[PDB]
Design a protein around this ligand. Structure first.
Ligand SMILES: OC[C@H]1O[C@@H](O)[C@H](O)[C@@H](O)[C@@H]1O
Ligand SMILES: OC[C@H]1O[C@@H](O)[C@H](O)[C@@H](O)[C@@H]1O
Ligand SMILES: OC[C@H]1O[C@@H](O)[C@H](O)[C@@H](O)[C@@H]1O
Ligand SMILES: OC[C@H]1O[C@@H](O)[C@H](O)[C@@H](O)[C@@H]1O
Ligand SMILES: [Mg+2]
Ligand SMILES: [Mg+2]
Ligand SMILES: [Mg+2]
Ligand SMILES: [Mg+2]
Ligand SMILES: [Mn+2]
Ligand SMILES: [Mn+2]
Ligand SMILES: [Mn+2]
Ligand SMILES: [Mn+2]
Lengths: 386, 386, 386, 386
């Protein structure tokens, strides 16, 4: 039951099932994982592909010879399994050089170096066939107000992304960029903190169509926001290039629980939205098996991500196909929300006496929206109590 | 000391000092205020102008005759004082007809009516000389996931604003629009919840240059975000048309404390940003004298808003002019953040061996940012302990 | 399916289904409800009883004659239905006199009056047979630091509750008190903000066994806390006298969604705890039909509360009875958590070399907790996907 | 100006200025510190003492010989400086064995080992002369609902603390215990999440007077709570044995900013409370120099903690001594809040017709509290603008 297949487009970062369990207050609870074993275990689970930071695949500071061998070993695991690599990203946050950021570090020479680090790995990711390159500016921010002139840092951020788009244009690459928002942690406040802030920033870029967003369930929930609403604006803007699925209990540190844990109802509305909008990119999981777990629990965790997606997919589809729900949807006038407000034109609106002079405001106000019956119907479908 | 003058551009809504003190769990603690007395008391305090919702000035459902008289009385108060009216807005939230929203209500006929209500008041606001019309979509949202298809609601929101911009274009008006974001309350989640989400939405509008944002200190703080950072992206985008100043203690209900209360340090960084960016619009206060206060406390509260702005203005200016702070700013390389990252070009960057092959990563990582000394200098200036 | 019966002990406040829909920014969307019709509609729904504030039942300032008639009418509705009245409370928050609090108002004469208001209604509630009197100090708090010396206000709070316990002792009443915590709203910060703070305060009271807590799902979630954990400490302390069930989306204004909405998984762990601990008090719903709803939606909302409780009751019972879950519970050593740590005594512990000198720390650290398989089993039961 | 002296009772953990800068997403930015150099640098800064976890002072797994030498070296640094050691604590969170907790780990043998680890270090701390032993149960909690029966875990927590109090009683020690609350991180939810929850738990202990709380500014602010209010209830309960001073920007990860950063106004109300209550324990700083800083910035950070305390001490004292503020305090009836509510007795209250039958509710409701003038006076004192 609810079994994933590579057609379901499930992918994982190497850093997810690979997380050794070091937290702010704790040491590692698990040994490191060869990227090769992760590709195989995930393939066995029904995964479609894997993603990586540059330093997850080639250990930082590796020699050219070792780099070649680390890729050779990795390529052979994908060949053996059929695994894909749909996305890659640069680690511009772990090494101490990035302590004040990467593309927006105050030191100019750190910013130039962060660009060379990203450009090197774009080459690699294109070779492995990734279609999306992700940027997570987790060190772009500040803990105190005077350490970062934000308008200046946005200037620098725009130059970094403009230059990156100039590079892939100059190489003929098909890869596109996806910014991953996060409101805080590790910096006290991170720049482009939400899906909205990232969409707005893309529109000031030189070639905007080259960039989209990679929202993560938990990051919007770290700011108390509605994740499906944010996804809806990303899809409305045509900029859902990639997505990160996980779970989060409200406003606290970045938990990265397996998908479906945390806010279960919001996961349901998310899957219903992705499916009904026909989202076709990877269903990528960016989670951390809690450091209480041994290797066996790591894989049960990753298996739980895909299962919970498949369960929610079925419930949400049953929801939208139920004729009682379709009748309730008409009752709540969801059909009327899809109709244009004034297809007749401004002038027609200005003269339509039934829109002001003769609008029975009290009659309209007395019409219930019937939202509770609709929502209780959604809950019954979620829980299988119809 | 720290005394405001109309040149300081301080303005107030009628609804602020006019708030009778009805909260979710409480009845009014103060009688209603004639808009005329508010104009006079505020003028006495050194205010520059007032703003209004349509229904703050003309009681809802007033006859044409009464409407004329309510304006006549108001115009005479501004003449008597020199008060201005720099901004107005529509009340699309109080009357029960707007319970599911205004421009995005599911019922089409409510949306058409909300447009006629706004268009009527734009006329009025232009007559009183407002330069900015504000939209706060406080009822645009939902409490449950199925009651609002967000992509549909954004379609409707785009039509409403496109139509409004078509109207002021057709009339030759100079007025511009400013969207006021809010993440939640009264709806469970509000659409365009943050400054970012509002900037992104404006870029999909038909004539974007006609629209900007009207951020409110407390609304971004309701989502745990850094208000000065948000303002910085608005100014970077050129869309700070208007601003709402108040105070807020973190993530909870919308408090609307007088400006300077709540997060005092963020108020300092905000004033420093507005001043150094040369923000020239009104310094508008959108606050609520706590319902514990009588009329005398209402005016002490409004007086505290302007005073706290003036105090912070002085401290922040002393901060940026102190040569020790200018030396610290160089120490933390804030000057280097303002320099372009690769004015030399992509190709020069790709060949600059000092940016990768010969970058001493460990030397750069070992250079402290000196952010703490800088911040302690800012604190000393704030508190007057230099 | 999942149909409630009065044996299920479901109760409602008059103020819940009675809420006219006035919010901070909106007018009423529904007419007022005669308490009699609410008793009948709720009875029809399978409810067990109703609760009331004094002013929900007798309008504030009623004459003795009218008071008698309002009770006569109410008593006859309970007789006609079999409805009970298991709990009552005082409204010490709506009238403007309570703007600085009730039992802790700065004005002494307001505090004395709040005590007389409560004592009058205790008499009434005992007559209607309530077994619990609830105190919600929603106005006990402050918006600014200097307006309330907290240690003084706790002195006053202790005197109010000591006096109340002296009264019911002097009358021979069986009724007990339950404090209802809330962290904020309407005050900027409320005293005794959490279940913990309320438990601690009770232990300083003169006759502590007379007082317990009445936690509300949403109020602990307004402070980002785990509601089942809080309930567990209340039950561990023996002070779960009453409970308020509803739903809440994280840290924001007090939403009072119907039970089961908001955090669905936490509702599941709550019902599992209440049932397995054998909680026997009323299952009281303190919710607000969203003001989008007409009268029909009000009753669908209240019906959804009981249904969602019954659904969760079944899933959680199926969870604890599943032998796979019982095997997983042993795997995660939940049985070992119930065993005493050192039944052998301090001295035996101090000499047990297998507890320090010869403890294989690395072997123990390498044992996974298997928490993910356990949790995925709980999720499968919740969703009916076993 | 504002210079600390050992009489000011300022102390620091070794782990604070000793923090190498490893965060969830980053490697160390600073070398490790010999505890000896920290004692000397802090002494030079005007600190009074240092605190330590067992593993900050003796590296985990040290041989008896090395242990002796690490203490010998440490004792000589305190002798050379006059530094004291007023508090110590056990590290029951870093080693992987504690991944499911210490005193409440599901594995019994981990709990026994955690007790032996604590008891060993109590001996040591008494030798160095600490007067308070702190317990921070940062691993006592859970990420999912089924992994920890909370009532069971409280049973285990009560046994651990009862046993610890049995030990210090059996040894004649004077040391007392202080529980340090935290709502979350590293566990998804931590047991005893707030000051309140910790006070309530102490009252169920065998010898409660042996235990108090060690609240930390940032931990209560992680749950949106008012830190001075929490301190006020701790002092009202007589259980402020110790305190941790730092700074925190609202509800997010545990930031541990230097004291005075984050919520500046709440720091002011805190210092005013500690001083006016005559708190006499150590003023302990539990902060992290941001990993952007080199060694020089570490010490500027620690210096900023004490300075900001001294500045706030002066402003708050000037506040309480200003006769205008004393007149305002009477205006807001803070004097009346300190008076008993019914010193005359229940019966006198029941017969006092001026408390109900003849209470002019409308007159009392119309009296403003004058809280805004009072608060603006407090702000003027904070900023030095009187
Ligand atoms: O760089 C991209 C990724 O970096 C990871 O280390 C973070 O955990 C993710 O939030 C992000 O998706
Ligand atoms: O409509 C604009 C205004 O409406 C007011 O009632 C709200 O309090 C403000 O948030 C908003 O600025
Ligand atoms: O007084 C007790 C009750 O008062 C109601 O008005 C509030 O909504 C509840 O939080 C509380 O249970
Ligand atoms: O164990 C006591 C201490 O442990 C430290 O590592 C934490 O950072 C503090 O929150 C706590 O005061
Ligand atoms: Mg991610
Ligand atoms: Mg506003
Ligand atoms: Mg309640
Ligand atoms: Mg601490
Ligand atoms: Mn994350
Ligand atoms: Mn507001
Ligand atoms: Mn509530
Ligand atoms: Mn901390």
């Amino acid at each position: 039951n609810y079994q994933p297949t590579p057609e379901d487009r499930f992918t994982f970062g190497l850093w997810t099932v690979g997380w050794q369990g070091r937290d702010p207050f704790g040491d590692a609870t698990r040994r490191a994982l060869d990227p090769v074993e992760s590709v195989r275990r995930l393939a066995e689970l029904g995964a479609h592909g894997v993603t990586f930071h540059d330093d997850d695949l080639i250990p930082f500071g590796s020699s050219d010879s070792e780099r070649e061998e680390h890729v050779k070993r990795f390529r052979q695991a994908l060949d053996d399994t059929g695994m894909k690599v749909p996305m890659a990203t640069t680690n511009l946050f772990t090494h101490p050089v990035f302590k004040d950021g990467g593309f927006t570090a105050n030191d100019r020479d750190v910013r130039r170096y962060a660009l060379r680090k990203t450009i090197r790995n774009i080459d690699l990711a294109v070779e492995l066939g990734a279609e999306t390159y992700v940027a997570w500016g987790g060190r772009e921010g500040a803990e105190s107000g005077g350490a970062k002139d934000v308008r200046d840092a946005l200037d620098r951020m725009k130059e970094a992304f403009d230059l990156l788009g100039e590079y892939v244009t100059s190489q003929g690459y098909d890869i596109r960029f996806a910014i991953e928002p996060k409101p805080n942690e590790p910096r006290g406040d991170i720049l482009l903190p939400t899906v909205g802030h990232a969409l707005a920033f893309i529109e000031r870029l030189e070639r905007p169509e080259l960039y989209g967003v990679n929202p993560e369930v938990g990051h919007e929930q770290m700011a108390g926001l509605n994740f499906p609403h944010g996804i809806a604006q990303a899809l409305w803007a045509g900029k859902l290039f990639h997505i990160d699925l996980n779970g989060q209990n409200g406003i606290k540190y970045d938990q990265d629980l397996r998908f479906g844990a945390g806010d279960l109802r919001a996961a349901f509305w998310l899957v219903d939205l992705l499916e009904s909008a026909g989202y076709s990119g990877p269903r990528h999981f960016d989670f951390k098996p809690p450091r209480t777990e041994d290797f066996d629990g790591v894989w049960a965790s990753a298996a739980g991500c895909m299962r919970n997606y498949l369960i929610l997919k079925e419930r949400a589809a049953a929801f939208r196909a139920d004729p009682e729900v379709q009748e309730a949807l008409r009752a709540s006038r969801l059909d009327e929300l899809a109709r244009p407000t004034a297809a007749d034109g401004l002038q027609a609106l200005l003269d339509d006496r039934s829109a002001f002079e003769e609008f029975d405001v009290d009659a309209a106000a007395a019409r219930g929206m019937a939202f509770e019956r609709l929502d209780q119907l959604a809950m019954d479908h979620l829980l299988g109590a119809r």
